[PDB]
Design a protein around this nucleic acid. Structure first.
Ligand SMILES: [Mg+2]
Ligand SMILES: [Mg+2]
Ligand SMILES: [Mg+2]
Ligand SMILES: [Mg+2]
Ligand SMILES: [Mg+2]
Ligand SMILES: [Mg+2]
Ligand SMILES: [Mg+2]
Ligand SMILES: [Mg+2]
Ligand SMILES: [Mg+2]
Ligand SMILES: [Mg+2]
Ligand SMILES: [Mg+2]
Ligand SMILES: [Mg+2]
Ligand SMILES: [Mg+2]
Ligand SMILES: [Mg+2]
Ligand SMILES: [Mg+2]
Ligand SMILES: [Mg+2]
Ligand SMILES: [Mg+2]
Ligand SMILES: [Mg+2]
Ligand SMILES: [Mg+2]
Ligand SMILES: [Mg+2]
Ligand SMILES: [Mg+2]
Ligand SMILES: [Mg+2]
Ligand SMILES: [Mg+2]
Ligand SMILES: [Mg+2]
Ligand SMILES: [Mg+2]
Ligand SMILES: [Mg+2]
Ligand SMILES: [Mg+2]
Ligand SMILES: [Mg+2]
Ligand SMILES: [Mg+2]
Ligand SMILES: [Mg+2]
Ligand SMILES: [Mg+2]
Ligand SMILES: [Mg+2]
Ligand SMILES: [Mg+2]
Ligand SMILES: [Mg+2]
Ligand SMILES: [Mg+2]
Ligand SMILES: [Mg+2]
Ligand SMILES: [Mg+2]
Ligand SMILES: [Mg+2]
Ligand SMILES: [Mg+2]
Ligand SMILES: [Mg+2]
Ligand SMILES: [Mg+2]
Ligand SMILES: [Mg+2]
Ligand SMILES: [Mg+2]
Ligand SMILES: [Mg+2]
Ligand SMILES: [Mg+2]
Ligand SMILES: [Mg+2]
Ligand SMILES: [Mg+2]
Ligand SMILES: [Mg+2]
Ligand SMILES: [Mg+2]
Ligand SMILES: [Mg+2]
Ligand SMILES: [Mg+2]
Ligand SMILES: [Mg+2]
Ligand SMILES: [Mg+2]
Ligand SMILES: [Mg+2]
Ligand SMILES: [Mg+2]
Ligand SMILES: [Mg+2]
Ligand SMILES: [Mg+2]
Ligand SMILES: [Mg+2]
Ligand SMILES: [Mg+2]
Ligand SMILES: [Mg+2]
Ligand SMILES: [Mg+2]
Ligand SMILES: [Mg+2]
Ligand SMILES: [Mg+2]
Ligand SMILES: [Mg+2]
Ligand SMILES: [Mg+2]
Ligand SMILES: [Mg+2]
Ligand SMILES: [Mg+2]
Ligand SMILES: [Mg+2]
Ligand SMILES: [Mg+2]
Ligand SMILES: [Mg+2]
Ligand SMILES: [Mg+2]
Ligand SMILES: [Mg+2]
Ligand SMILES: [Mg+2]
Lengths: 159, 171, 208, 296, 59, 23
RNA sequence: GGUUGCGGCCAUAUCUAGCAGAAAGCACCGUUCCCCGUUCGAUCAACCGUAGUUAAGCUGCUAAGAGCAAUACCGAGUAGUGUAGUGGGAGACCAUACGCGAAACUAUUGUGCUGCAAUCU
RNA sequence: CCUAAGGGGGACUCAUGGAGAACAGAAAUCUCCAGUAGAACAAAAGGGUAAAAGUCCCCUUGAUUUUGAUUUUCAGUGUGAA
RNA sequence: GAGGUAAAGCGAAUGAUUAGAAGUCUUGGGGUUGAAAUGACCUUAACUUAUUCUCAAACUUUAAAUAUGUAAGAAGUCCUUGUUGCUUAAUUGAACGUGGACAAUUGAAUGAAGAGCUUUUAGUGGGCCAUUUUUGGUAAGCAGAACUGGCGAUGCGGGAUGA
C-alpha cells in the first residue's frame, strides 16, 4: 500500500529545533510584512493553521497579499518543462524576511555614496564587483623562519 | 541569623482522613463524623482505579478527608495527642518535616457516641512550615524555599518536644 | 539446515537488527565474550594482542563461538586457565534472512541467524596476558584465525592491557598516582569537576 | 536504591523557558493574544493598559510593544495620589479608580484630547463606554492587561478599568466584573458601584468597626485618627481628588535628592566583584595543599 | 503479464529541449486573490487619483 | 456536597504498574 | 549603579551547595465588615501599611561544581564525499589524481546582554 | 467514533520516584518534596502541545449562511481533504 | 535560506548490548550467629554509583559532499506631497500616483546563428544496457527504483568475434 498524504515524509522537516519547542517568541508576531517583501518559508510544526505544504518548506518568495494573520506568497514551481505561479496563504509563524535583500540594498547605498564622493572630488570610481583574482608577487622574509625540512613518516601501528 | 522571628516553626495544616473501604451509608457516616469534628463540610475521595482484592472499583467514592487550619487545627491536634497520651515515634516524621499518627476510635477524641454512627478510626497528618511558604503557593513569581528555611525532621521533632512536653520514641 | 557461510559473507543489505519490527529472531550462538581470568587487575596482564580484520565482511555468530572456543581451549591447555583474559570485540547484531524456509513472489525472508559486520582494521578478539606468555597467546589466536573467513592479522598492542595508554604512559600515570583500580579496569584522574571528590579519590596524587 | 534523577544529561537536555516566564511574571499566551495586531494595519500599534499591584503601590501604564522592547506612553502610580489629596489607603478599590482616572487624563493631555473626550464628569456608577464624537477623531483605544491577576467580580483591576473608561479613554469592557454586579439577576446595581468608587466600603467599615471594637479601630485606622478624618468626609477626599486630577493630570517627577552619578557611585560601593582567574587558581592550590592533612 | 512500473529516465532530456523557461515578469502583477476590502477601496483611490491628474493637466 | 477532582490523566488505567505481587 | 513595572533576544540567563545584601523598591508579613472563592481567607477576593522581618523570595559573590556558550598549529586535512583512469585486487575491497571536507576527542576562555517608564544614601 | 471527544474562557498540572499516616499488606485514601513531560490528547504511526493542545469546571452551537480565491494529488481536469 | 543522507555518537535521550569494582533498612534465595531476637556473619542474585566491550532502515545531540530556494537595480534608490468609501487616537499607515535628484562601470563572471509568441498535426505510450547510489533474493545473462550517459534509431577505428 502506497501512502502519499499531505505531511508524508515530513518527520524531520517539520520537527522543532532541539531545545526550541514550545511558545513562539513574539518578534514573530511583531514583524510587518508588506506586498513585495521577500520572505523565506519555514513551516513551524507547532502552528498547524496556515501551514505550508512540504514543498514550500525552505523556499523563498514574494508577498502579494496581507491579511489578518497571514501573507500570500508567490512561488514559481517547476511542473515539467515550465514554471507555474503558485499563490500560497501562510500564517506569519511560518514566514521570515529574506536576508538577501539587505546585502544588495546596502551595496546600492555604498555605490551611491562612493559615486557622489568621486563626483564631489571630480574623479572616477568603478562600482562593478569583481571575483577574487590571482594573488600578486610577494617576498617572504626568513628571519626567525628558516625552512624546516619534512619527510614522509614510516608506518606504525598504534593499537 | 538562625534566631530570627520569621524562622518560627508553626503548623500549616491538619488533614483528617477516614478511608472506609466501601461506598454508601458507611462513607456517609464517616463524613458526618468528620463534619462534626471539624465543623466544615468534608470532601469525599474517589478510587483512582479498580482493585478486586480490596473490593473497590474506579470512581467509587471510597475515602473522606478534610483540611483544617488555624486555632481549630491546634485544638484538634492536641485533642488527638491526648488520645496518643503525647507519645509519637521517630518514624512518624517524614524527611520533609511533616508528621502524622492514626487513632483507632473517634469517640476517644471526646465527642458523643451514636449507635447509628458507630465508631470509625481516623488518620491525622500535620503539615509543618515556617513563614514565607506563600512564595511556593502564590500564582505570580512562584519560587523555591532556601535550604535553611526548609522544614526538616530534626527541627520538627525538637519543636514538637518543646511545645508539647511529649516524647518521640524510635522503636 | 544452515547454509554455507559463503551465502552471507558480504554486507549487501542494510543492518537488520532485532527490534520491535522483527521479533522472531533466534539467539546468537556466542553468549560469552570475556574468558580466562577476567577479574585480573590491569597491572597483572600488561601485554595485549589483537586479532584484526583486513576485510569489510560479515562473521557469523557460529564462527565467533567456534573461534572463541578454539583460542580459549588452546591457551588454557598450554598456559593454564588463569594466564590470560580473552575478550571478543565484535557482537553479532545483524540478522540474516532465508526465503525458502511460489518462487520469487512474496520473497521476504525469515530470520535465520546472526552475524557481526566488521570493517577493515576492526579488532575481533583481544587477549591480555603477561609478556612471557606471548608465544602461547599468539598461537592461540592464530588457530582461531582458521575459524574465520577472510584475512586477519595478529597485532601486538603498543598499550598496557586493555587501556588506551601506551605501556610507557601507563607507567608514568602509575608512578604519579593518577590511576586507581576499579576491579578489572582502572579510573584515571580528572582535572575538572569537584576538587574535593577528585582529591579524595586519588590520595597519592603528586600535584605540581 | 533508586536512580539519581538530576544527572548531567538531564541538565544537558533541559530546555529553559523564557526568562520572564521562569520568573513567573509574564503569561505569554495572554500576551500574544493582547499584543498581536492585524497584519493589514501594518505599523498601527495596539495599546495595553498594564495594571499591576504591589503590596504598597498601584502601577498603571499605557504600553505599546516593539521588537526592542515595550515602550511606555504614559504612566500613573498610586504614590502620585498624595499630590491629588489621597494620602492613605493607596490600594483601595477607590485608589485604583483614581489611578485609572489619572492615567486616562494624563494620556489625553499628552495626546491633546482634553476638551474633546472629557469622560464621565458626574460619576453615578452607571456602566458606560467612551463613545466617539461625530466628525472627529476616534477616542484613544486601549485594551486592559491584568497580567497574572485573577479575574473576579469585585477585583481592584477593574477599578482602574472604570477610571480609565471614565477618564475619556475608550476601553472595551463589560460590567459583570465590577463590584455590585448581581450574577443571579444579570443587572448592575450602580448605587453600590458608585459607593465603591468613592470609598464607601472603607467608610462603612470604619463606622461598623468603631462601635464594635475601638482598640482595633485605633490600630487599623491610626492615620485617620491623627488627621481627624472621619467616615462622612471620606467621599469628599475622593470628590476633590477627582477634580484635582482633572485640573492638572500632568506628571510631576519627584525632585531627586542626589544626581544620577552620585546614586551610581553610592550603589557601586557594595556588591562583591568577581575574582580574577589567578586568585581562584591560588585558592585551588591552597585547597589542594590543605587537603593533605586527611591522608590517613 | 508484468511490465515496467515507473521510471523518470529521459524525462529531464524532454523537459530541456524547449522548456525550463523562467516566467516572464511584468510591471503590474494581477491582483487576483488580493483582499476584497483592500481591492474595493483601491478602486476608489485610483479613480480619484486619475481625476486629480486630469484637472491639473486641464489647468 | 464536594468531592476530589481527578488531577491525573490515566483515563484507561484501571490498575497500576510497579504493583507486582511477590514484591 | 541598585530596585520595581512592562519587555526583546530566550541557559553566558539553567541546576546544586554555601556566603553576603546600605538606600529605595520588592517581598514575606497583619486582618475578615465589605465584592469574591474555597473542605480549609492555604490559593483566589477584599481591608489596613497599622504590629513585625530580611529568616525566606529577589539580587550579587564563591565552586580544579554539573550544564550551557565561545574560541583553536586540539583531533584532522582524519571519516565521508563530487569528479577520473583499458589503476591494483579472484573477490571483499584498496591506492592514486583534481576538489569539498566532518563528528567525537583535547585545551582554553566566559557564565546574561539589553529597550521603555518610574524610583533610590 | 464524538452534543462533545466541537467552540470560547478560567483554574490546575500529568508519568513516575522518595519520605511519611489506624485497620492498610506489592496495589485502596491522605501529606510534603522532587518531577522537560519520562503521561495524556477516540483510533495506525509520525509530528505538535506545560500558568497547555493535557485534567477539571462554567457558558454555548462557528459541526451555521452566501459564494469567490488558493494548496495537495494534478492534465495544473474531477473527487476527497485543507 | 531550506534539508537530516554519508560520516559520527552511545562514561548524550530512546532501544540493543560484554565485563568486572564499591555500596544500600523492601536485599531473592541457601548455611547460619542465633533457644528465639531480622538484629550480624559466608555466599550468590538484584538494584544504585562511577566505569567497561559492542550496536540501530523504520535511533539520535552534531553533521557533510553532491544536489536545492531566492537576490545581484532604470519596472532601481532617495526627496516632496496628491487619491480613497480601507486603516490609525491621529494629520497614523496601506496601495497607486504628480513633481525633483542620481547618466553609461546603470551596479559580478562566461556565453548567446537573437529574443519572445501563436496555431496545428505525426509517431510513441512493450524498452533495454553501462558507471555510480540502491531494494528483494543464496544467487541469476533474475526482479525492482535514483541520476547521468548510451543502445534502441548508429554507421566508422579498437575490444579476434559481440546492440
Ligand atoms: Mg502493509
Ligand atoms: Mg509506505
Ligand atoms: Mg528541521
Ligand atoms: Mg483545523
Ligand atoms: Mg564612474
Ligand atoms: Mg471493602
Ligand atoms: Mg539486498
Ligand atoms: Mg556456533
Ligand atoms: Mg503464480
Ligand atoms: Mg582466516
Ligand atoms: Mg530557552
Ligand atoms: Mg488569561
Ligand atoms: Mg498484462
Ligand atoms: Mg508500460
Ligand atoms: Mg536547449
Ligand atoms: Mg485521559
Ligand atoms: Mg478499572
Ligand atoms: Mg558597569
Ligand atoms: Mg529596606
Ligand atoms: Mg491570608
Ligand atoms: Mg488576594
Ligand atoms: Mg531576603
Ligand atoms: Mg537574606
Ligand atoms: Mg563547569
Ligand atoms: Mg567551567
Ligand atoms: Mg573517493
Ligand atoms: Mg557531485
Ligand atoms: Mg570511474
Ligand atoms: Mg591497458
Ligand atoms: Mg584528496
Ligand atoms: Mg550564574
Ligand atoms: Mg480537543
Ligand atoms: Mg470545549
Ligand atoms: Mg476546552
Ligand atoms: Mg485555558
Ligand atoms: Mg525527568
Ligand atoms: Mg458536518
Ligand atoms: Mg483539487
Ligand atoms: Mg486522484
Ligand atoms: Mg490540474
Ligand atoms: Mg487542480
Ligand atoms: Mg477542487
Ligand atoms: Mg529521510
Ligand atoms: Mg549511518
Ligand atoms: Mg554510520
Ligand atoms: Mg556524533
Ligand atoms: Mg545509548
Ligand atoms: Mg552518564
Ligand atoms: Mg555530556
Ligand atoms: Mg542503554
Ligand atoms: Mg555508605
Ligand atoms: Mg547458607
Ligand atoms: Mg560543533
Ligand atoms: Mg543544522
Ligand atoms: Mg549545506
Ligand atoms: Mg505632507
Ligand atoms: Mg517621478
Ligand atoms: Mg562576484
Ligand atoms: Mg500531435
Ligand atoms: Mg502533439
Ligand atoms: Mg499525440
Ligand atoms: Mg496519436
Ligand atoms: Mg518488455
Ligand atoms: Mg505497444
Ligand atoms: Mg556509458
Ligand atoms: Mg569504476
Ligand atoms: Mg533490471
Ligand atoms: Mg523481464
Ligand atoms: Mg522498436
Ligand atoms: Mg554510437
Ligand atoms: Mg570493427
Ligand atoms: Mg567492433
Ligand atoms: Mg576479447
Amino acid at each position: 500500500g502506497k501512502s502519499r498524504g499531505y505531511r508524508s515524509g515530513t518527520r524531520y522537516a517539520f520537527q522543532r529545533d532541539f531545545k526550541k519547542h514550545g511558545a513562539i517568541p513574539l518578534s514573530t508576531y511583531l514583524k510587518v510584512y508588506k506586498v513585495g517583501d521577500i520572505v523565506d518559508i519555514k513551516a513551524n510544526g507547532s502552528i498547524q493553521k496556515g501551514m505550508p505544504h512540504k514543498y514550500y518548506h525552505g523556499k523563498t518568495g514574494i508577498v502579494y497579499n496581507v491579511t489578518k494573520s497571514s501573507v500570500g506568497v508567490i512561488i514559481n514551481k517547476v511542473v515539467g518543462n515550465r514554471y507555474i505561479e503558485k499563490r500560497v496563504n501562510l500564517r506569519v509563524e511560518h514566514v521570515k524576511h529574506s536576508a538577501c535583500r539587505q546585502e544588495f540594498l546596502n551595496r546600492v547605498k555604498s555605490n551611491a555614496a562612493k559615486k557622489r564622493e568621486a563626483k564631489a572630488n571630480g574623479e572616477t570610481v568603478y562600482l562593478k564587483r569583481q571575483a577574487a583574482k590571482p594573488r600578486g608577487s610577494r617576498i617572504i622574509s626568513t628571519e626567525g623562519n628558516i625552512p624546516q625540512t619534512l619527510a614522509p613518516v614510516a608506518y606504525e601501528t598504534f593499537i | 541569623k538562625s534566631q530570627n522571628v520569621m524562622r518560627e516553626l508553626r503548623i500549616e495544616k491538619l488533614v483528617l482522613n477516614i478511608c472506609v473501604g466501601e461506598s454508601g451509608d458507611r462513607l456517609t457516616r464517616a463524613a458526618k463524623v468528620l463534619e462534626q469534628l471539624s465543623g466544615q463540610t468534608p470532601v469525599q475521595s474517589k478510587a483512582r482505579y479498580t482493585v478486586r482484592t480490596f473490593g473497590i472499583r474506579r470512581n467509587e467514592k471510597i475515602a473522606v478527608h478534610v483540611t483544617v487550619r488555624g486555632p481549630k487545627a491546634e485544638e484538634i491536634l492536641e485533642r488527638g495527642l491526648k488520645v496518643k497520651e503525647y507519645q509519637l515515634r521517630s518514624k512518624n516524621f517524614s524527611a520533609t518535616g511533616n508528621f502524622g499518627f492514626g487513632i483507632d476510635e473517634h469517640i476517644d477524641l471526646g465527642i458523643k457516641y451514636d449507635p447509628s454512627i458507630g465508631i470509625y478510626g481516623m488518620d491525622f497528618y500535620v503539615v509543618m512550615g515556617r513563614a514565607g511558604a506563600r512564595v511556593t503557593r502564590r500564582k505570580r513569581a512562584r519560587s523555591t524555599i532556601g535550604n535553611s528555611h526548609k522544614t526538616n525532621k530534626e527541627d520538627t521533632i525538637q519543636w514538637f518536644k518543646t511545645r508539647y512536653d511529649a516524647e518521640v520514641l524510635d522503636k | 539446515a544452515r547454509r554455507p557461510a559463503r551465502c552471507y559473507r558480504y554486507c549487501k543489505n542494510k543492518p537488520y537488527p532485532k527490534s520491535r519490527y522483527n521479533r522472531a529472531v533466534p539467539d546468537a550462538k556466542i553468549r560469552i565474550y570475556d574468558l580466562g581470568r577476567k577479574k585480573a587487575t590491569v597491572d597483572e596482564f600488561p601485554l595485549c594482542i589483537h586479532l584484526v580484520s583486513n576485510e569489510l565482511e560479515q562473521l557469523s555468530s557460529e564462527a565467533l563461538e567456534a573461534a572463541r572456543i578454539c583460542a580459549n581451549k588452546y591457551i588454557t591447555k598450554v598456559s593454564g586457565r588463569d594466564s590470560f583474559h580473552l575478550r571478543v570485540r565484535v557482537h553479532p547484531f545483524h540478522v540474516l534472512r532465508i526465503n525458502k524456509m511460489q518462487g520469487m513472489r512474496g520473497a521476504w525472508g525469515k530470520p535465520h541467524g546472526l552475524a557481526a559486520r566488521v570493517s577493515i582494521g576492526q579488532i575481533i578478539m583481544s587477549a591480555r596476558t603477561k609478556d612471557s606468555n606471548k608465544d602461547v597467546v599468539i598461537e592461540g589466536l592464530r588457530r582461531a584465525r582458521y575459524k574465520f573467513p577472510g584475512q586477519q592479522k595478529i597485532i601486538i598492542s603498543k598499550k598496557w592491557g586493555f587501556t588506551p595508554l601506551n605501556r610507557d604512559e601507563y607507567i608514568a600515570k602509575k608512578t604519579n598516582g593518577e590511576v586507581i583500580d576499579d576491579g578489572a579496569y582502572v579510573k584515571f584522574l580528572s582535572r575538572k569537576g569537584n576538587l574535593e571528590a577528585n582529591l579524595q579519590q586519588f590520595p597519592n596524587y603528586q600535584y605540581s | 536504591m533508586q536512580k539519581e534523577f538530576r544527572t548531567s544529561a538531564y541538565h544537558s537536555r533541559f530546555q529553559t523557558p523564557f526568562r520572564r516566564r521562569q520568573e513567573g511574571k509574564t503569561d505569554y499566551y495572554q500576551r500574544k493574544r493582547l499584543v498581536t495586531q492585524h497584519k493589514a494595519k501594518y505599523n498601527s500599534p495596539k495599546y495595553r493598559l498594564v495594571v499591576r499591584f504591589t503590596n504598597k503601590d498601584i502601577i498603571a501604564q499605557i504600553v505599546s510593544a516593539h521588537i526592542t522592547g515595550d515602550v511606555v506612553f504614559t504612566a500613573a502610580y498610586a504614590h502620585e495620589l498624595p499630590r491629588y489629596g489621597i494620602k492613605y489607603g493607596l490600594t483601595n478599590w477607590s485608589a485604583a479608580y483614581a489611578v485609572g482616572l489619572l492615567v486616562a487624563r494624563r494620556a489625553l493631555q499628552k495626546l491633546g484630547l482634553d476638551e474633546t473626550y472629557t469622560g464621565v464628569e458626574e460619576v453615578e456608577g452607571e456602566f458606560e463606554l467612551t463613545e466617539a464624537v461625530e466628525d472627529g477623531p476616534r477616542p484613544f483605544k486601549v485594551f486592559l492587561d491584568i497580567g497574572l491577576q485573577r479575574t473576579t467580580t469585585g477585583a481592584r483591576v477593574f477599578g482602574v478599568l472604570k477610571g480609565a473608561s471614565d477618564g475619556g479613554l475608550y476601553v472595551p469592557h463589560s460590567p459583570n466584573r465590577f463590584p455590585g454586579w448581581d450574577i443571579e439577576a444579570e443587572e448592575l446595581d450602580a448605587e453600590l458601584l458608585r459607593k465603591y468608587i468613592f470609598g464607601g466600603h472603607v467608610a462603612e467599615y470604619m463606622e461598623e468597626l468603631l462601635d464594635d471594637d475601638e482598640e482595633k479601630y485605633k490600630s487599623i485606622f491610626k492615620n485617620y485618627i491623627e488627621e481627624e478624618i472621619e467616615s462622612e468626609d471620606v467621599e469628599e477626599i475622593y470628590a476633590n481628588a477627582h477634580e484635582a486630577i482633572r485640573a492638572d493630570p500632568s506628571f510631576k517627577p519627584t525632585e531627586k535628592k542626589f544626581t544620577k552619578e552620585q546614586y551610581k557611585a553610592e550603589s557601586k560601593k557594595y556588591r562583591q566583584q568577581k575574582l580574577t582567574r589567578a586568585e581562584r587558581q591560588a585558592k585551588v592550590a591552597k585547597k589542594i595543599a590543605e587537603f593533605k592533612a586527611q591522608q590517613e | 503479464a508484468k511490465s515496467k512500473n515507473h521510471t523518470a529516465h529521459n524525462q529531464t532530456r524532454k523537459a530541456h529541449r524547449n522548456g525550463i523557461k523562467k516566467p516572464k515578469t511584468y510591471k503590474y502583477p494581477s491582483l487576483k486573490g488580493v483582499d476584497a476590502k483592500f481591492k474595493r477601496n483601491h478602486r476608489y483611490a485610483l479613480h480619484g487619483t486619475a481625476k486629480a491628474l486630469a484637472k491639473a493637466r486641464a489647468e | 456536597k464536594n468531592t476530589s477532582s481527578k488531577k491525573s490523566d490515566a483515563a484507561p488505567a484501571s490498575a497500576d504498574p510497579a504493583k507486582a505481587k511477590k514484591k
